[PDB]
Design a protein around this ligand. Structure first.
Ligand SMILES: Nc1ncnc2c1ncn2[C@@H]1O[C@H](COP(=O)(O)OP(=O)(O)O)[C@@H](O)[C@H]1O
Ligand SMILES: [Mg+2]
Length: 304
């Protein structure tokens, strides 16, 4: 049940931002300590350097393809029956959706592509895998099918489902295409896109991988790819408590975990416990105008 935290600094939006009054310096991974550190300083007091450590830090030069080089190995563990959770955390504008859904290389598209390649490869070993998914949103602690919804936890299989939620088989790149196209259009920022709403809700792309080796072996693993509501400072209190609860749970898992204190953590409890693997992605802007929210985000990531 390993937990890791990565930080990703997105490229500056030239013509809109600059780093005139702040500095974010990323150090090279430290193989003697096993982590990578970064320093953040505000011009108003350059003697105060805030240091942060992460399992890996991606800078403005790291593309989505670069990011996946470090995520591919995590997601493939689902074919072995491990559950996986990947959370994109950060203020609105930091790059959560781009990271998770950018057409072709986002974490979700890359994951599906990667899993498919592994499935085809595993066929030569007598393995037969079936893939199905759901795309939901949690807004104001209520579940919404983005494609009555009650959470059903099966203590027997240690699996979870949601009643009346659309689930689609993923047996073709064509089905993946239309679904990922709809997902992006729904969450990405487009004129006729509900970004306002999207920024205030959590979206979860769920992928179930069921395999059978007619060796007689069987395998079931679930991947939960979450694009969290913006972390920037009753709907607002819902977001605050939900993110805070998630932080409490992830941190507790890394040490009574408060899974039931939020809809999100309650939904994913089986994918957060046992030998499940969790990756927390903290997205931040490199710009001086966002420096305070950036420091907030980095502080949340630390305790996590
Ligand atoms: N890694 C990145 N590389 C290039 N552009 C990015 C990257 N991350 C975000 N962006 C751009 O920054 C803006 C913030 O995008 P978005 O992903 O929607 O943020 P958030 O989901 O956190 O609110 C978008 O216009 C997006 O295209
Ligand atoms: Mg977004």
């Amino acid at each position: 049940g390993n937990i890791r935290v990565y930080c990703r600094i997105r490229p500056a939006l030239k013509n809109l931002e600059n780093s005139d009054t702040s500095l974010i310096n990323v150090n090279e991974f430290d193989d003697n300590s096993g982590v990578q550190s970064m320093e953040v300083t505000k011009i108003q007091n350059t003697a105060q350097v805030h240091e942060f450590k992460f399992d890996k830090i991606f800078d403005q030069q790291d593309t989505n393809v670069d990011v996946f080089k470090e995520v591919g190995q995590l997601v493939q563990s689902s074919l072995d029956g491990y559950n996986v959770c990947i959370f994109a955390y950060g203020q609105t504008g930091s790059g959560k959706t781009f990271t998770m859904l950018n057409p072709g290389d986002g974490i979700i598209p890359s994951t599906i592509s990667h899993i498919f390649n592994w499935i085809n490869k595993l066929k030569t070993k007598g393995w037969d895998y079936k893939v199905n998914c759901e795309f939901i949103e949690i807004y104001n602690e209520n579940i919404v099918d983005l494609l009555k919804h009650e959470i059903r936890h099966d203590q027997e299989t240690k699996t979870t489902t949601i009643t009346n939620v659309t689930s689609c088989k993923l047996e073709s790149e064509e089905m993946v295409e239309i679904i990922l196209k709809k997902a992006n259009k729904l969450r990405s920022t487009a004129s006729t896109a509900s970004n306002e709403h999207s920024s205030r809700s959590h979206s979860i792309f769920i992928i179930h991988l069921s395999g059978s080796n007619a060796t007689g072996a069987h395998s079931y693993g679930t991947l939960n790819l979450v694009d969290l509501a913006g972390s920037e400072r009753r709907e607002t209190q819902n977001i605050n408590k939900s993110l805070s609860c998630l932080g409490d749970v992830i941190h507790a898992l890394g040490q009574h975990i408060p899974f039931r204190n939020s809809k999100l953590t309650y939904l994913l409890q089986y994918s957060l416990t046992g030998d499940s693997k969790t990756l927390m992605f903290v997205n931040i802007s490199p710009s001086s105008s966002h420096i305070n929210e950036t420091l907030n985000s980095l502080r949340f990531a630390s305790k996590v």
